[PDB]
Amino acid sequence: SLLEFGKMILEETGKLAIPSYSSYGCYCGWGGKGTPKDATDRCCFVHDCCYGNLPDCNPKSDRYKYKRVNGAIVCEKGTSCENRICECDKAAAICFRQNLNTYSKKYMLYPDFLCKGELKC
């Protein structure tokens, strides 16, 4: 659930998922169109695509479990949806980590109209 994806992001990036990745670029937090502005935005785009593959699950509210084995995120057995959801988040978090170096503040609170273009998953 959103509580876990959040905590996952913090451990990983030391950034509060709430400011930092809730209104970044075109796909971070809401968002449903245009061209990702950068890596981090690409990450969100993929994450959003990842959820797209689970039509009958509920990402934002279904909770799951995960442990860390030396920092390695490990999704634990739960429901089919929960496992799959946990995997999708896991990826996003790593993605975020991997692009911290390009995180740009100018992409926080990005205006909607600047998100032009089309992109398929």
């Binding site: 992001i9 709430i18 934002k60």
Partner: peptide, 4 residues
Amino acid sequence: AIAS
């Protein structure tokens, strides 16, 4: 609230 929410994350991505």
